[PDB]
Amino acid sequence: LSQFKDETNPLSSLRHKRRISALGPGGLTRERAGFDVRDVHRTHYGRICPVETPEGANIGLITSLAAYARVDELGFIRTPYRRVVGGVVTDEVVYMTATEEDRYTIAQANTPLEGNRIAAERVVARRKGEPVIVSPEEVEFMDVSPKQVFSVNTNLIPFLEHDDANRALMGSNMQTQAVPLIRAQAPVVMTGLEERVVRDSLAALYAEEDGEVAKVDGNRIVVRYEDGRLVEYPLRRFYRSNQGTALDQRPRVVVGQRVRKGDLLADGPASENGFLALGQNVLVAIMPFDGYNFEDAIVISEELLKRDFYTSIHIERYEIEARDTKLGPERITRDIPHLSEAALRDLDEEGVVRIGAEVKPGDILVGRTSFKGESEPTPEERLLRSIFGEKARDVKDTSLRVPPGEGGIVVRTVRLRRGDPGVELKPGVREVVRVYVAQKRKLQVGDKLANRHGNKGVVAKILPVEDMPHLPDGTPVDVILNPLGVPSRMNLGQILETHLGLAGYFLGQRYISPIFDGAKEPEIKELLAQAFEVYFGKRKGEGFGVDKREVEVLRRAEKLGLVTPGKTPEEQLKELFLQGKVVLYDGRTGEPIEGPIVVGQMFIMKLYHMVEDKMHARSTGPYSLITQQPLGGKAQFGGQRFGEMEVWALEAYGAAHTLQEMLTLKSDDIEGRNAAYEAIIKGEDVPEPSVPESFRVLVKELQALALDVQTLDEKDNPVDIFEGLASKR
Amino acid sequence: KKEVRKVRIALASPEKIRSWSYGEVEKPETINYRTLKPERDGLFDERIFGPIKDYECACGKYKRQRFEGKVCERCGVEVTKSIVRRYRMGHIELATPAAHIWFVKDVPSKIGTLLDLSATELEQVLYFSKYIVLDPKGAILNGVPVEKRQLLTDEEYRELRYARMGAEAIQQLLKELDLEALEKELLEEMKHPSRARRAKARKRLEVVRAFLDSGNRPEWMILEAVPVLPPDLRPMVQVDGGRFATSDLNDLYRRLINRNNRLKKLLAQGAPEIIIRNEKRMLQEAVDALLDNGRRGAPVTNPGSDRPLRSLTDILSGKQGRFRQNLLGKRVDYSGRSVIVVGPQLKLHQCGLPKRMALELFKPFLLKKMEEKGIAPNVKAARRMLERQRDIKDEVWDALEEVIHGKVVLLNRAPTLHRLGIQAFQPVLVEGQSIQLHPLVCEAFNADFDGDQMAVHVPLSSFAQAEARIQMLSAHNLLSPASGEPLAKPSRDIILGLYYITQVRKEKKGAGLEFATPEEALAAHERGEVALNAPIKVAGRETSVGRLKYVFANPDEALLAVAHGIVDLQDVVTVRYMGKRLETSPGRILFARIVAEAVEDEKVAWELIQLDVPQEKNSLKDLVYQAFLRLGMEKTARLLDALKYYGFTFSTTSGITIGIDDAVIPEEKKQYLEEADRKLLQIEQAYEMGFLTDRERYDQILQLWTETTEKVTQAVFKNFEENYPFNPLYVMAQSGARGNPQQIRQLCGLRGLMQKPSGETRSSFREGLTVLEYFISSHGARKGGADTALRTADSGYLTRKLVDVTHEIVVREADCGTTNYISVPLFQPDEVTRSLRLRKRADIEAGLYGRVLAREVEVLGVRLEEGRYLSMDDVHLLIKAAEAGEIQEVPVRSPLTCQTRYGVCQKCYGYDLSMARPVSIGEAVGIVAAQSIGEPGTQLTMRTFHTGGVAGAADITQGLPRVIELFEARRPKAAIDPHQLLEAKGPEAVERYLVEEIQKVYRAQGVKLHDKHIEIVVRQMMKYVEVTDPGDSRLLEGQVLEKWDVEALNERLIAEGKTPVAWKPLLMGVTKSALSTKSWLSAASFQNTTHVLTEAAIAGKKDELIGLKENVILGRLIPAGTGSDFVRFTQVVDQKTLKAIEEARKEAVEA
Amino acid sequence: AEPGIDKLFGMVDSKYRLTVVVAKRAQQLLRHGFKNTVLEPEERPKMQTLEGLFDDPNAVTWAMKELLTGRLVFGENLVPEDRLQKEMERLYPVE
DNA sequence: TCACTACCACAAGCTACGCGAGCGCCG
RNA sequence: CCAGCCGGCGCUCGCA
DNA sequence: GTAGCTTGTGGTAGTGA
Ligand SMILES: [Zn+2]
Ligand SMILES: [Zn+2]
């Protein structure tokens, strides 16, 4: 039941903190029984978010709870409902138990009201998980707010009302995987909780009571409250999240500043201005390019990387120990026994790497030296030493190196010596060493991003702003989405965001659309009309009117039926601008793209690059003791699984030797893999496969069981698998 | 160095135990803490299992490879690696016998069945309890003469003295049994008495023969010596700080030593019966522990984790058992994986790969290449140079860039459903992380770009490198092994761009449209266009003004105006081609020219290029198909790469983007939602006075919203058809590109009305979908993700069975000469009353495409020779002819009737190899059919019933369930019972029902696969039959049919004495067909892995290795593919070596 | 794609057989030295850092081009099993 | 007659449950 | 040439 | 949990030494 804190981002940490599970002591629920349980039951109202659960084998069982849902005395998640006597509503509320809930007639909050008086006779209400249209007279209790039925996690999506529940989970789940960006900006559109989140979570730091500002260090901020008190508030400089993420608090206030009780002091890891901010709002073009935004493929502007827009600071806590072998305690020293001084530069401090140094895959992070043999010296390695320089330090190199993939800059180091001040030093362990290194994993092409709605995609190309699409006004887009991945998936909620974000750019402002009660289509056209004044009004006064390009498309647009023919292009454009689409020039050819293309400020996010992101490529390496199948982990990547699903595929094809190759020389065949390596090194042709181990070990298992498994030849007679290790004496 | 052609499971003789065994484990002394060395002769002593060190020994007399096969005169140690240890077994001399629980507790207790005692409870009763027996003779009484084989207790046995018991009791029994004697005894009991007692004797008789026949006699069933698994096998490691992990077998292997040793001391100390047994219970129980845990209670490791220590069974059977481990194979050395990202420029022939990865991959190939150049002196040197990323010189990148040459690799997607789930490409090194995949394959491996992760390997052997770039190279795998249909079909992206350009536009027709005749209609109606009255695309039949104003000579001519902004590609113009005055749009012709560009044969291009209509997914499907056919593989390839780029670039500029206003709402809904809401009250006010009831009020409301939803579905698409032919959301759905059909509106109904949690069933997504309206639909999207979840499990599982059975099925042949053909029906009887109808286009295509005629046929006027392979063009011919009324069925060769015992001929199968020409001999069809079947099975789309009244729309969909009940003989929930069907109409009939009764599904899901595959399978279900008139072996028996074609063929033909082998055809489910197969190598793989061998040991089964499953596990080259004896031997020669051997000939003339 | 893949196709009665051929051929080309060819003069395989494919880039790619010509011959049992490995090391030098 | 059971039915017993991937920790 | 990473728990993805 | 494959044995009408 208890797990690592998904501290991707304080929010991620906060949800990982609110989710409910099924599996457990075992007396409660087992794993293979759940069709009726995993169902989103009718009482799950305002108590359980029916969106929060994880997609996969373990679904419905694991699920975080609703907004206000709270446990009373004995685990009964009550949910609030305002009281109402007659046709009169109350500012009073009651947390009702699921049981007591069915007892009454509850109504939605969408319900019109004069402050305390209902407004419609035939108004909606829900009896016991049953939709019933009742009169204002039989009304006994109402929902507090639409937010109460979803999780905090889920309550964060703008136009959730226009998106499908299924892709909503993807939106909700993907939020727990966000990553703290150096530059964090709260969503161009919010629902109104991002403040609350950071507040209720301990992201940002708040002011206790009214007061004034004293010291504003990059490490500490001291204040003098109005009650004559003053405190020094230390700031978490740079700490390693359990997920290996950055944890800092960025002051945003100046010295000597009269502050209000509970005003943002320093921005938490991911708060723009005490507002939850993860990812940034980007200008985006909802159009298809060559193929770079294929099915869920995406296209980025080199312009975004220039202004370190999407950069993630990631911290991996590699770790190594100085074991005490009876062959001789593994020593820690800058002595790397065999080859260069070139690789001993950065390892300044005796054994220690200097902080603030650039580390690439393959470099030694920490030097370690144990002893060569198991217990005896070596006869072939003995004569070789004497030749060049018999006097060579017998200690072996078992030094922590930069695992292939990527390394960054060592920022912090920790070393625990003999005289334990007060630490639980495991037995045999002489001493330990932790190294924290981070890298501006610059949003590269391999990375993936997604909006709060569910659209998921991997960056296909990093176009130079030079030729990527640009507005009639020099300003170029940041990203280009593939429309295709939109009609199929059901979430017009994002289309409304790009549009609304559109206004905000030339209107320079943010907004807050509650869940079901947020903004509306007409209202949006309003602002657009107004934003069109910013875009073109400015363009008109700036000395010029329209381009021959803006008209070619206008011709095509009128023919389209997007614009009512017969209007002055000035008017036509406005009408087309209100449609959420504007004209865009190719930038590569500068020829406009026949047909207006909607665009907008879409708030999108970067997604977790597990060490599963940083690729795994293996040639040769470790194998399993029992099964002689290859594996990795620390340094050696670790092989990939072939699975039968795949076997069969090859089985479909006539890949006989290709299949032979896999089962053997490539995985289990010992003398095959061995001699194989020797073969390719020679540029020769692989010998013929010997018996795989998983097989040999298998027979013996069988033989261990009374079962006797014997190999046979053409004419039913013995053959020998065990090359000669089965015969006695 | 030969090849193992047969595997054999047989019981083990005590001596054979001694045989595999090296020394005897006699004490539970693993390893003593102070010394990480094996304690004593314990379970880890190296004598008993193997050299604790490489080639090295104990004290150190001999230490290298020079003397690998000699032992040290002082302490005995021959050495290879430590493998020897993980190889060698051990044996424990048990005090008093005990027996394998596998045979004792197997449903048909293989021991209680054989020995007639209460097949079940009595076993339990004395085996783990107290009851003694008498050996040969015992002259004195108890009340009745010596019980030659009956049992007595120690009490009326103790009295006597002044015999053996437990498992020591049945030990004697088995020995004194003269199989023969009792064989004669049951043969009689079987046929004479009635079914009651005759029935038992019968099943009871299989076990016996089993022993005798095979020889391997049954006396070994009891245990007195236990084989010890090598050491290395069950781990004994150093976790951390001092922690140690050891395979649980050791916790039980110790539980066992203690008691046996405890017993040797107990029996040698004093013998108080009570406690003697108390421990024999614990003994025999610990026995079962390591063999099988759970079959009887479950032993736990002391307080820390109440987890049943994994037993031998659990190790062999299961989803991740041992067979599970092997049958599927698990970890390559040269592998890798990373995220995917599109490669537009990428040609099918190649694929983009991050250098950095490559680096590690072709490490060896590179290394060698290093020394080859001046970059590195020696190997070790080259490695050190690469040990770090900042040590790399730019020159290295050249060498690597060099070793890869044309060398190619394979790409695997997440779920590997079919052969295309993996393909070979020409890696073109690249910077960064992600991996560039070509897009049209996205459909092959069901994969979109939303985070998709896949794998990759390298054809090391030049032999293995060969096949890859050859038969695995994607470019050569265009068609679908499922449907002769291509699988490189343009996708949602390209196609979108391709449709844009070729669509024709129609605008306004307010004034005259009949230029068809008037010349004043040419002048006047031409000035009206110049004006504002007549548009450029008016609905005039002879030619709208668009054609009149502009006329183009040469092709180029026309395109020059477009760019000049005089004409748009979607305009109806008039242009002349190589020989015709044609009236068509700029886009339609452009498409034509491009066609001619990719491939030079300009004339053969337009032959299949109907540029009448806007290019849709099927028209392109039909063209790609064509191309591949007419022109040839590689040439049809240079094509795909072309369309790709253009449908890509065409998409960019098309300027299509979804807008909120784009999702346009019909003005219509308000009226119809009103005309329907008014009828709801006519039916609700129906409720007040009892014209109806409860059941009927519910059904009529269902039909109201079932007919009204289909009504709003036509309207949105009709409006887009007449008013907005070019809507991003519309044009998207119509093109193969992207969209949904039942789904959009169906989706709307779903959000508006979704069924309740159980199943008992106003807003759009454009307009606010109300609060509750969103929670109601949640129940379904909730059930949908769960249903599909179990569906993937059953699909791979189903398919797992497909392979379990059709693996062995391959094309090793010479036209199976048995010409017993199947007749393919063209007309279907009952869809209403009694009527005759022409089956569907598709279905029929699916039944006859690329097949083999059993006999000649003269239809409409052409002569269809016997044996010819009919192409789709021919398959169409018949249609037109049946339409005529000259033909009703079709004599066709098929596997169901192919002769070839194990395998099928090239004639019984057909056309479609990945290519279109006849299938090449040595093709693993058993698999290809299995995949092409199991890949579609997962998605498991919607199933339900939808019924209307007056408009009258009834929809019919069903789930995998049936598919299951089908492949597995079963008794459907409500359906035609096969067992009865066969009885009624016989084989050729059931055969036919199955197949057709299985096709209905996919037909109902949009999926399109050929019947071949299914046949394959079903024939496999009917490869066994029962008996009725004996010859060699007794009647009632289920066995291999063809194998009977063998014995019968010889009982009449060769050896005289016509002993009619009256048999009875037997039906078996896919499951049960695999379960019981000749080879057990395949059977041991699935099910318990218990019974499988249990049965195959008794009978020293000589598993003739034919088939892949069995031969794969061995890691032996596949009996097929390249291992097909047909081709596995083939020599190549240069004309220079020919005359050479010819001279080895000319020199033979002596003196 | 690959040159005249269709040409080659029709040349065989069975696909999987084709594979066997080339393979055992490029195996020969390597083993007994790489000068064991039959079409090097004028037109021949080629690479581009320089034009050195002429020596030993991809064997199978060569066997392709050769096989695309009517030079070689393939039969179930054309020349006595072991008598072939003896006469192939006698006339081709490369090492 | 005497008598042994013979043969239908229903409860009761084991085996599946896609493919791959990573991350912290547990003895 | 020797080691931590056996297994597993729990968690995320791709394919709707 | 869920369906389902198979065995095994006890419960309710026959029938011949
Ligand atoms: Zn010695
Ligand atoms: Zn046949």
From Swiss-Prot, chain A:
It catalyses: RNA(n) + a ribonucleoside 5'-triphosphate = RNA(n+1) + diphosphate. One of its GO terms (cellular component) is DNA-directed RNA polymerase complex. The keyword ATP-binding does not apply. One of its GO terms (biological process) is DNA-templated transcription. Its EC number is 2.7.7.6. Keywords: DNA-directed RNA polymerase, Nucleotidyltransferase, Transcription, Transferase. It is an enzyme of class 2 (transferase). GO terms for molecular function: DNA binding; DNA-directed RNA polymerase activity; ribonucleoside binding. Belongs to the RNA polymerase beta chain family. DNA-dependent RNA polymerase catalyzes the transcription of DNA into RNA using the four ribonucleoside triphosphates as substrates. The RNAP catalytic core consists of 2 alpha, 1 beta, 1 beta' and 1 omega subunit. When a sigma factor is associated with the core the holoenzyme is formed, which can initiate transcription. This is DNA-directed RNA polymerase subunit beta. It comes from Thermus thermophilus (strain ATCC 27634 / DSM 579 / HB8).
From Swiss-Prot, chain B:
One of its GO terms (biological process) is DNA-templated transcription. It catalyses: RNA(n) + a ribonucleoside 5'-triphosphate = RNA(n+1) + diphosphate. Binds 1 Mg(2+) ion per subunit. Its cofactor is Mg(2+); Zn(2+). One of its GO terms (molecular function) is zinc ion binding. Zn(2+) 1 binds at C57, C59, C72, C75. Its EC number is 2.7.7.6. GO terms for cellular component: DNA-directed RNA polymerase complex. The keyword Cell membrane does not apply. Mg(2+) binds at D448, D450, D452. Keywords: DNA-directed RNA polymerase, Magnesium, Metal-binding, Nucleotidyltransferase, Transcription, Transferase, Zinc. InterPro entries: DNA-dir_RpoC_beta_prime, DNA-dir_RpoC_beta_prime_bact, RNA_pol_asu, RNA_pol_N, RNA_pol_Rpb1_1, RNA_pol_Rpb1_3, RNA_pol_Rpb1_3_sf, RNA_pol_Rpb1_4. Zn(2+) 2 binds at C816, C898, C905, C908. The RNAP catalytic core consists of 2 alpha, 1 beta, 1 beta' and 1 omega subunit. When a sigma factor is associated with the core the holoenzyme is formed, which can initiate transcription. Belongs to the RNA polymerase beta' chain family. PANTHER family: DNA-DIRECTED RNA POLYMERASE, DNA-DIRECTED RNA POLYMERASE SUBUNIT BETA. DNA-dependent RNA polymerase catalyzes the transcription of DNA into RNA using the four ribonucleoside triphosphates as substrates. This is DNA-directed RNA polymerase subunit beta'.
Curated annotation (Swiss-Prot), chain C:
Its EC number is 2.7.7.6. One of its GO terms (biological process) is DNA-templated transcription. One of its GO terms (molecular function) is DNA-directed RNA polymerase activity. Pfam families: RNA_pol_Rpb6. It catalyses: RNA(n) + a ribonucleoside 5'-triphosphate = RNA(n+1) + diphosphate. GO terms for cellular component: DNA-directed RNA polymerase complex. It is an enzyme of class 2 (transferase). InterPro entries: DNA-dir_RNA_pol_omega, Pol_omega/Rpo6/RPB6, RPB6/omega-like_sf. The keyword Transcription applies. Keywords: DNA-directed RNA polymerase, Nucleotidyltransferase, Transcription, Transferase. HAMAP family: RNApol_bact_RpoZ. Belongs to the RNA polymerase subunit omega family. Promotes RNA polymerase assembly. Latches the N- and C-terminal regions of the beta' subunit thereby facilitating its interaction with the beta and alpha subunits. NCBIfam families: rpoZ. The RNAP catalytic core consists of 2 alpha, 1 beta, 1 beta' and 1 omega subunit. When a sigma factor is associated with the core the holoenzyme is formed, which can initiate transcription. This is DNA-directed RNA polymerase subunit omega. It comes from Thermus thermophilus (strain ATCC 27634 / DSM 579 / HB8).
